Design a binder for this molecule. Structure first.
Ligand code: MG
Lengths: 299, 299
């Protein structure tokens, strides 16, 4: 048997246990892909990342769920680069390239006002489609009634890499009552039956934050609810810039929060940029992260 | 998008192109399994080896044929360690360990009777089974008549890691007449259909060597003839100690030659020890290697 040290960092939070868990093997150059998959299974977190040597970038990363390899994982990238940086395991520079199976990712490493290191990455340009299904059926699928929805803002499918349904609800009291019936989502979401559902409101628990959301997994995911979701956060930023606060020049940013209803406290910073030659908004997200624990896995 | 330097050293010879070609990537830590497989396919050698980081041994190695990964490769290990040492990429030591998927291999290094650097490896204790099939079909499958076989020595399946059939034939003249019909081997070798066939005789081209072999690959392999075969040579040494000369004091060494019929000239040194612990023969082999070329592979 071999002994592998695995770290647990929580992404998109500054407090242990209050974010999206990210397993990390800080130097995976001694491992095969089969070993990586087995380590991720034994770790049993939603995802475990492996830091590797690269021929074409500063580093390479592979991302695994307990059952399969993913081409990309935003929260795993945030947690992993944060850990490398904070541990003294990176070169002295404010940007990094990461070789992945989906391409080379440029990463920016910065510090926020509070002195915390933030990891910033680009998402895919946003796409929206109107939701044309039944609002009452949608409300019921998340344990609500139709008058819990916010009539003033549109329900839309949105993607900056993965499709989710942005469902505006009246306030936090509504969010607290939600109960996802994920198995029924496909019947309600005709256009994109495998989308997740991400209800939102502008009322927030955290003071510096502009939007609140909750994330309910697709019917095809197995899971019920994700703690702090970087992909959906990017969609929320694009949505905000498109439907809520449209009047900006060049660049705006907002912070979204997630996880309070399940005893967490996640925050994602979303940067929305427009350029005169670009057909769509440009979306970046950034988050900080925090050490949770380290433990041994035998393989 | 990646340019990989591939080295070619011939194993089990001191003369360029007179041994068993070993493709070598000296630092493969930037590569996936798929990339390593693709490089092996492009190179086209019977085996290409990849040097990788290890947390539990001096180095780690993976071995690939043009089509699939192998668990072990003696000639690739010899060529690779010889190359690493030649280029100063290993701590210069008389012993080291190599992590492989099949286990950690202890390796010894020294200077042989001929003044060349040897790489020495432990094989598995010999297993034998009598060949009970048709000697006629066997002889024909190697382009011989049944009369060309040496009746005074037994035909056996033998393994020190890979099953092969030791087929004693008259002499070197008979060896030169041979031509393998590998496709028919499984139908001939009823007991172990996927075995290779390794004819031998005690007449040698080099008077300072003890046994002559030739290696005809299994039907399943992507080859027809292997130039200098470490596994089979270990079986030959065991065979010598078991069936030819059983009278020695604790340990003996012999040299086997292979490759002359295809215009090469390989040598494997075989160490046979009467292990008191296992109460069975213990077999090591060693050989030298030689630089042939370097070239780039784009993947
Ligand atoms: Mg590797």
């Amino acid at each position: 048997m071999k002994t592998i040290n695995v770290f647990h960092y929580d992404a998109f939070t500054n407090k242990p246990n209050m974010g999206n868990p990210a397993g990390i093997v800080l130097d995976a150059d001694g491992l095969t892909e089969e070993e990586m998959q087995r380590i991720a299974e034994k770790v049993g977190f939603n995802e475990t990342s492996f830091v590797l040597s690269s021929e074409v970038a500063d580093i390479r990363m592979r991302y695994f769920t307990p059952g399969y390899e993913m081409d990309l994982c935003g929260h795993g990238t945030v947690g992993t680069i944060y850990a490398l940086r904070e541990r003294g395991l990176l070169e002295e520079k404010a940007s990094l390239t990461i070789e992945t199976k989906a391409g080379i990712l440029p990463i920016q490493i910065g510090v926020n006002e509070n002195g915390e290191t933030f990891i910033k990455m680009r998402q895919t340009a946003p796409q929206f489609k109107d939701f044309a299904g039944s609002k009452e059926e949608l409300a019921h699928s998340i344990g609500l009634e139709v008058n819990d929805l916010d009539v003033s803002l549109p329900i839309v499918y949105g993607s900056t890499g993965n499709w989710t349904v942005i469902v505006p609800v009246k306030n936090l009291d509504v969010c607290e009552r939600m109960k996802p019936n994920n198995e029924v989502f496909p019947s309600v979401l005709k256009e994109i039956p495998n989308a997740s559902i991400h209800p939102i409101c502008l009322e927030t628990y955290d003071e510096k934050v502009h939007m609140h959301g909750r994330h309910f997994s697709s019917a095809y995911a197995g899971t019920i609810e994700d703690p702090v979701t970087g992909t959906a956060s990017g969609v929320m930023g694009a949505y905000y810039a498109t439907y809520v606060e449209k009047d900006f020049d060049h660049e705006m940013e907002l912070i979204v929060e997630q996880g309070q209803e399940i005893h967490k406290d996640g925050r994602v910073t979303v940067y929305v940029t427009k350029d005169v030659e670009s057909e769509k908004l440009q979306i970046d997200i950034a988050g900080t992260a925090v050490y949770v624990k380290e433990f041994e896995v035998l393989i």
